[PDB]
Design a protein around this ligand. Structure first.
Ligand SMILES: *[C@@H]1O[C@H](CO)[C@@H](O[C@@H]2O[C@H](CO)[C@@H](O[C@@H]3O[C@H](CO)[C@@H](O)[C@H](O)[C@@H]3O)[C@H](O)[C@H]2NC(C)=O)[C@H](O)[C@H]1NC(C)=O
Ligand SMILES: Nc1nc(N)c2nc(CNc3ccc(C(=O)N[C@@H](CCC(=O)O)C(=O)O)cc3)cnc2n1
Ligand SMILES: [Cl-]
Ligand SMILES: [Cl-]
Ligand SMILES: [K+]
Length: 205
């Protein structure tokens, strides 16, 4: 229960423990009061093919800004959230010992993400496994054609749930209900996802 709260997962860049980061860059700044990412990490993850994982979002031509902002926001959450304890799973990968499974993403966040990416393209419905890495950057592998986002993600859930091997599940709860993790939030009344982590930590027990 409580041991799942306010933790950082054992992954490539994560800090060991949550802590204030007043200099979090741009989109990551709402995490500045309590975060699992360093300022350095937040700065780098905004860049195209950043040194974080050498991951290229423009693998099928340039990805539109309206769409890119969501992938950037998603990376901020992955790298900076101290509130995903309840969904942390043990995996034995070379670059992380842990990851998330079935984080209850607010349906609107997923809907908006999916909608904003319609004009963009990709060659894969899962961005976690199957890329051609031989060049040092992910490239479209054999058998993978470039298509519109909707071809590979026919619905919002296909995007949010398929993208990183089910790191998210789409929650039927809405933004501000306190019953789902929000990707996008202002920290006016603090981080809305603490309450959420606290709720499921107990509810999933
Ligand atoms: C996900 O959440 C939404 C609510 O945000 C759920 O929608 C509601 O579903 C019920 C039926 O299961 C709808 O009810 C039918 O509604 C009409 C009234 O408009 C009523 O006359 C019928 O007797 C019947 O109850 C209800 O309208 C709908 N809510 C809204 C605001 O439209 C949905 O069920 C949830 N999904 C799951 C899988 O739980
Ligand atoms: N929940 C969540 N949210 C994110 N934003 C997120 N972003 C990334 C981006 N960083 C990546 C790093 C490595 C790979 C990689 O080496 N893939 C191999 C699999 C084999 C292996 O494991 O080596 C392949 O292509 O076959 C792919 C992506 C990764 N996970 C994420 N998870
Ligand atoms: Cl807008
Ligand atoms: Cl693996
Ligand atoms: K959070």
């Amino acid at each position: 229960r409580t041991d799942l709260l306010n933790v950082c997962m054992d992954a490539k860049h994560h800090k060991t423990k949550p802590g204030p980061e007043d200099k979090l860059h741009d989109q990551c700044s709402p995490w500045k009061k309590n975060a699992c990412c360093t300022a350095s990490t937040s700065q780098e993850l905004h860049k195209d093919t950043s040194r974080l994982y050498n991951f290229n979002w423009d693998h099928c031509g340039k990805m539109e800004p309206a769409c890119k902002r969501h992938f950037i926001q998603d990376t901020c959450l992955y790298e900076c959230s101290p509130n995903l304890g309840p969904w942390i799973q043990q995996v034995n990968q070379s670059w992380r010992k842990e990851r998330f499974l079935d984080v209850p993403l607010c349906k609107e966040d997923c809907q908006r993400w999916w909608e904003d990416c319609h004009t963009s393209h990709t060659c894969k419905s899962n961005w976690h496994r199957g890329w051609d890495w031989t060049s040092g950057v992910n490239k479209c592998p054999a058998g993978a054609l470039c298509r519109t986002f909707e071809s590979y993600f026919p619905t919002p859930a296909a995007l949010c749930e398929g993208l990183w091997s089910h790191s998210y599940k789409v929650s039927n709860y809405s933004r501000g209900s306190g019953r789902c993790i929000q990707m996008w939030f202002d920290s006016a009344q603090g981080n809305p996802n603490e309450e959420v982590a606290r709720f499921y930590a107990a509810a999933m027990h």
